[PDB]
Amino acid sequence: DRKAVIKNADMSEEMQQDAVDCATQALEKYNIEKDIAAYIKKEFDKKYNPTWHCIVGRNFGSYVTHETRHFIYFYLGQVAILLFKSG
Amino acid sequence: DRKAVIKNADMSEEMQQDAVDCATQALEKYNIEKDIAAYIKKEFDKKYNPTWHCIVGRNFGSYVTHETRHFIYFYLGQVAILLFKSG
Q1: CA pair distance A74, B29, nearest whole angstrom
Q2: CA–CA separation, A18 and A24 (whole Å)
Q3: Is the CB of B7 inside 8 Å of chain A's CB atoms?
Q4: N or C: which end of chain A has fewer CB within 10 A?
Q5: Which sign does the torsion angle of CA B60, A66, B63, A20 carry?
């Protein structure tokens, strides 16, 4: 099982833990990046209200405008996950 | 120079061309993914109003909620670019 490394976050500690949990569940269920991303996005829309956006990959870079306290960029093993609400 | 392949788009033809042009300029200037993404995002905020978000990589997958007519996912060579406004 996979090592969580949080790279950048503007998010409550409890929500960061839910993000890691959600992504862990997603990787258990799915192997294709877009399917992993959709699972996480949908779960966060449910738990923490719409509207979330999720990117899953390895090496991608990003520049997004996020809502205060609704942003995380982290790795689970070698898989990078960006999850945020837009500002 | 790089071959443009548009994978998915919900965007005017003129705006798609500007996206390809912007990304071409970005790749001429910068080598690091997050810097490429920031250039494109900033140019689209200027030309087509805030608020855009941009991901640059190779193999990433995504699931985002986009504003009608403000979404493109395309490749320039092997570089994948996602550019959208949130719905």
Answers
A1: 27
A2: 10
A3: no
A4: N
A5: positive
In contact, A62 and A54? CB cutoff 8 Å: no
Cα A54 to Cα A64: distance, rounded to the nearest angstrom: 11
Tell me if chain A has a CB within 8 Å of the CB of B3: no
Q: For residue A34, give the nearest of B32, B56, B63 by CB distance.
A: B63
Separation between Cα atoms, residue A29 and residue A26, nearest integer Å: 5
Way the structure was solved: X-ray
Backbone angles phi, psi at A30, to 5 degrees: -130, 150
Using alpha carbons, select from A83, A87, A81 the residue that is nearest to residue A15. A83
CA distance B34 to B47: 20
Instruction: For residue B22, give how far its alpha carbon lies from the nearest alpha carbon of chain A (Å).
Output: 15
List the strands of the sheet with A66-76, edge to edge: A4-10, A66-76, A79-86, A52-57, B61-63
SS3 of chain A: CCCEEEEEEECCHHHHHHHHHHHHHHHHHCCCHHHHHHHHHHHHHHHHCCCEEEEEECCCEEECCEEEEEEEEEEECCEEEEEEEEC
Contacts of A7 in chain B (CB under 8 A): none
Q: How many residues does chain A have?
A: 87
